[PDB]
Amino acid sequence: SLRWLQFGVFSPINRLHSSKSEFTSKEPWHFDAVIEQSMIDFLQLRHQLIPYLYSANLITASEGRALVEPLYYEYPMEEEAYQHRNQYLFGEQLMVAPITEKMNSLLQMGSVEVWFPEGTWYDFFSGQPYDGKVSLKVYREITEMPVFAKAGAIIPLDKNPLKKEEIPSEIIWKIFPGADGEYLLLEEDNETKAEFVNGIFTVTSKKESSRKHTIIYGEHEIVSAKRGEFSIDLNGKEENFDWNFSTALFRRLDIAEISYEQKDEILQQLSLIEEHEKQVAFIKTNENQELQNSLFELLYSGK
Amino acid sequence: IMSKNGFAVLADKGKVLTEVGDIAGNSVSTIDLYLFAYGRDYRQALKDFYQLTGNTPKLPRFALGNWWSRYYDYSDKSYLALMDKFTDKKVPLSVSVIDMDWHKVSEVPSRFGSGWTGYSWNKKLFPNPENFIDELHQRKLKVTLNDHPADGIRAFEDPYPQVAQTLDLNTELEEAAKFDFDNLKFRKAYFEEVHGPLEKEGVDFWWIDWQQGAISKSGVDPLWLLNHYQYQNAQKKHKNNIILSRYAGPGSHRYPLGFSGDSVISWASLDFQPYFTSTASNIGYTWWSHDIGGHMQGYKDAELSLRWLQFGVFSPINRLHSSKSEFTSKEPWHFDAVIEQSMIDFLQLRHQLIPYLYSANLITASEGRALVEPLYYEYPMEEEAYQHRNQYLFGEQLMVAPITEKMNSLLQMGSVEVWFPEGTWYDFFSGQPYDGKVSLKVYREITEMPVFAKAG
Amino acid sequence: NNIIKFDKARFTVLTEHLIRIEYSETGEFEERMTQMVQNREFSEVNFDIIEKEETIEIITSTVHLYYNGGEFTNASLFADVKFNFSVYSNRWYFGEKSDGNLKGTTRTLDMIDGECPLEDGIMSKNGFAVLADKGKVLTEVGDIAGNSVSTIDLYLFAYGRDYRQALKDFYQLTGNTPKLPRFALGNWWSRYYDYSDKSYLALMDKFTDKKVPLSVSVIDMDWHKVSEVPSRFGSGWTGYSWNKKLFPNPENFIDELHQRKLKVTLNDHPADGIRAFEDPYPQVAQTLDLNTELEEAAKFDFDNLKFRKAYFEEVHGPLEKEGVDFWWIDWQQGAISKSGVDPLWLLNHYQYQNAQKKHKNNIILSRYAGPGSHRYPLGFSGDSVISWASLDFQPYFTSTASNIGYTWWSHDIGGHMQGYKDAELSLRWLQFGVFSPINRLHSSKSEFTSKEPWHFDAVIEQSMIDFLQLRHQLIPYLYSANLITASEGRALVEPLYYEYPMEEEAYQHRNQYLFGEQLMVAPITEKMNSLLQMGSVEVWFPEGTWYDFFSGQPYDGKVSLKVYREITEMPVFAKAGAIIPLDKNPLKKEEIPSEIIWKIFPGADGEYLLLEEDNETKAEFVNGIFTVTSKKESSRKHTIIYGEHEIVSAKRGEFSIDLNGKEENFDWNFSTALFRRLDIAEISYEQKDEILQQLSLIEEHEKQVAFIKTNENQELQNSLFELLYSGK
């Protein structure tokens, strides 16, 4: 149910359905605490994503651009774009590869094979970086989902999903550092242009409005509840996210159902060895292969 | 001293003791034996054993709460922060155990060897030990420290000069690590100038960690002498004080408490532990203190931790223990929400059960009735009372059958085989009724435990 | 000086890490030599004594001894050891078994298929060990003098993790190993078969035709009369009479064997004794005792002086006059001691003492007889089964043998008895044997157990021939290592922790060892993977650059790696800067080679010292300059190999040369190796083309590793990862 709903949040229409049975309730409080909290968070995220979905709707009605697109619409001349069926593009800024297989009980994490085209990609939620053209097996807990944005992406989000407003009163702009960025938020009777050129972020409006703007650069808040169309310089700020190799490695080793001595040995050796090639060589000797793949993903992110 | 056949033989292999409590050498008798022929009256046999070898002394009330112990390099402010976090999460605690890192370890001079032995406060981590102990007592916690007497009193110790004036001054340039617990003067110096200032600082009782292979010097096991004299000395600090030490054969039940440790973190250890604890009553050792969480080695399983703690709450002593590893924390907030809430609920239940445990303690000290008893103590003439090892009686009102096997993923419920004697029994938590003599497989979720009380 | 009396015990400080402890109840202490100990004249060190009324205390720079008087017990006598590394328990108790010992050898070979229970040695990870002198008193001439006066005698070794110094001091205490002759370092041939003289000569000529060099010919017990013994006498295993039906002219046969430049040995079975039907029996009858009326004189009692003289002068005498070089003593008995002394020890001692007149620095074949047997080489094992488990166990046994001073083991190459047939097992076993102390091919009485190279198919036969030639190519290196071992006491085959004692990985690889002082060997002891057509082995590489001795594949610093080789290849590695001397003409039989090839691995400075019988050649490689100098005048020619390219061929005299402008790289490249590895794999063709194309197209190393991580077959993953790591 949790995985299905995670897929549904990043689908065209999110419609929870239950039948005539007391065993088929889809209410979040029908499950345990962890599942319920994850469901509530994703249901809130769906309403956070409404302005993006409406802008994609207007684009589809005007020019005829599908909200959900296969990989080979943007990369038609590459073979890997035809070998990943469940990977797609959600709008024009995000790439989604949902996890549709049961979790590995040893690792307590599900997995999915993801193809990354040329460029730098970041996880939409944690900020984990990914390099250019490569096929990689990525692992996520049941409360996490693989969604990626390339460097330079600009995402608008509603700041108050719980409040029911015909138009949001404040919008958060999420910027992924690394390149120039472009976005055009279309509304019923307005058009907001967001530019990110040479480290300068500019927001302009076609009509007068009382909307406030909050800026997120990586993970750090830049300006909160700024009023009116404006410009700002982000060259001196911190481009990096909050993701680092050590904390992620400790978290992955902490939830694995393996022997303690193995966990301490892996942590100590991966902290001690400096060269990346020798780190990969060290993890290549491990007898458990899914743990090998998870550690390889962590090492590739932190190269 | 218990047998299904009806008789057993206890061999008095020990050494002669004086009227004050001192060793008097080998016995004149070549061999001495005690034949117990009580049949299947095990309670009377235990009472007469306690009459022969001495009743178990009373335990203090604070010993019946939750103990916290972690082998970590704690600082005073960090320790206080951890205790405040425990208070914030609604987790009651009774005893704070500070491991060997309370003293100097890595700053011992190169000449001296293993810095495991120590009697000097680490001022870098504990700038004001008196204030730290005062804060701990302000939070109403009893404090104990780990002690490693194996090496001895070296010259770098802060209290070393005083002992030097008592036992023997160094001839030209030497030291006085003469750990020979047979001499009266050495014992006096160790109990007055070594432990004395620390107990004045506010230390309540002492954790004696003697991990040695019985290096007897006068034909007597040093651990027995340590236990005897340390328990005799602990009585001046508090009324009915206790120690932490190890088992030393029959007659050790007079000096509580004795811990086991050294268990691996696995489902097999959890399967074995209830049987070991209940069977310990057959020799008069009724105050075992197991390592709650496991000790070393093993694999990770949150369900294993939850089940282990559920067993520990209904055990003689509840002492959560963690080792020097960031992956072996036993804190409730180290797990997910469901496991954490279940752990918090059971830790609260342990302190809810304290008056019952103290009444059982007083009964045990007075008449000699074990808190944890095997099924065949109350139903000696029935075969099923000998076919359920992990089922026991907790006090005189409750029957406990802990679940020590992994949950069935299809049902999301663990199971255990329980024998119900004649009468009506109710689940202590849900009130589910059970009829008379019957063997039944019962199923509980990981957040539930099988505990039963009979009607009335 | 270094003698301390206390109570009924005596303590001697032989050195700062070795302490002798003696306890005698009567009151007299042993002073003469024993079976094990041959010398106690060490230097003088600094130590302190603390004396009480009833206790004594001994202070040494690394050990601290406590004795409480009376009998020795863990409560009375014990000690502490102070070392830089730490340990859970650093206190030694008398009589209490201690853990951490690195084990030694075994008196009897007793493994069923694989591992056998070993005995303790003088090396420990904790840092101390105790050697008990349980032997019997020896006189100043070499005769048993009965039981020792001392009740118990012990030697405490407290060298910590300095194993080389401990071995050197053990050799000082018990005597250095004598030198071995050059011919013992070649290939030995042995088959238990009913050979005729003409058939044996034909077999030797066949070996010569197939280009296989040999050094020693071993003739088993069928050389004497077996089935012609009269009914009265029992087992015909004992024999000293030539079988004239098979050997009409033994003198001419030995002359032909020496004409082919082979050393000849014969099997001897002294257990029964000298019976009356022997050809030399009358002579012995005149020496020991004439038969009273009608009897015989099979009085095999090796304690009597007169019997030993007669057996060494009249039994072995004529045979050694015919031309027999050394003797193979096959005493398969369960220690039937008559005077409390093991007869095998006396046989070894007196036979080795006797063999020195025939040749300078002669040897024998016999069995191990406890500590102190290293003075009488050689000792063979045999009795191993022909299985993969025995091959798995053998390198560890051979390398661990150095912990007790026994460094000249001679295993049965091919297995001995029972077992199953596998040509790959034979090839792997021989590959291990070529890089072992002694290479001795052995076959039993069965037409199915022949070890001849032509008994197999073409590939196996060619590989065996190549490795047999390489063994004779390696002879100068082995002889130099022999001279070093006899001089300073350095084992030819050493465990990894002799050179890297501070590193944990040096204790986690049992079958990896150091062969001499320049090469590191990790033999493959498991069956090939049929999918990859390659066997594999886990190898630990210490800090620095290493190259494969045969292909030149490079390997980086400290790393654990699974390496893959075909059945015709072996993992042998040399670090950068190594210098290896090789014989240029292994097929030619020369007492000293006329030309030597020097193989140099580029990357660092290098140094080698080739020791010969009457010469010393020094090879320096400093700052790209290679210099060869000689102690004495010689006509030897020198050839230089830098990487794989020849530098100078048949250069004469001591010289110097500059190699800065040459090509440091070898012939190994990633593309050809990858193509070869993919060409022999039994996988789909499309997979091979995809792997080759993608690995040729992707430039970054990280993305190449990421590409190979997605492959579903994991052994192919490991092979490709080894190739990618080499070519980084």
Author numbering:
A (entry chain D): 437 to 739
B (entry chain A): 133 to 588
C (entry chain B): 12 to 739
The authors write:
Finally, crystal structures in complex with nigerooligosaccharides and kojibiose along with mutational analysis revealed the active site residues involved in substrate recognition in this enzyme. This study reports the first structure of a bacterial GH31 α-1,3-glucosidase and provides new insight into the substrate specificity of GH31 enzymes and the physiological functions of bacterial and fungal GH31_u1 members.
The cryo-EM structure revealed the hexameric state of LlGH31_u1, and the overall cryo-EM structure was similar to the crystal structure (5 A and B). The Cα root-mean-square deviation between the cryo-EM and crystal structures is 1.340 Å. In both the cryo-EM and crystal structures, most amino acid residues at the hexamer interface were identical. The cryo-EM maps for the side chains of the amino acid residues in the C-terminal α-helix domain were well resolved, and most of their conformations were almost identical to those in the crystal structure. At the C-terminal α-helix domain, Val716 and Phe732 hydrophobically interact, and Gln728 forms a hydrogen bond with Lys720. By contrast, the local resolutions of insert 1 and insert 2 on A-domain and a loop containing Tyr99 on N-domain (discussed below) are lower than those of the other regions, and the cryo-EM map of these side chains is unclear. Furthermore, slight structural differences between the crystal and cryo-EM structures were observed. However, the cryo-EM structure suggested the flexibility of this residue, and this tyrosine residue is not strictly conserved among LlGH31_u1 homologs, including CmGH31_u1.
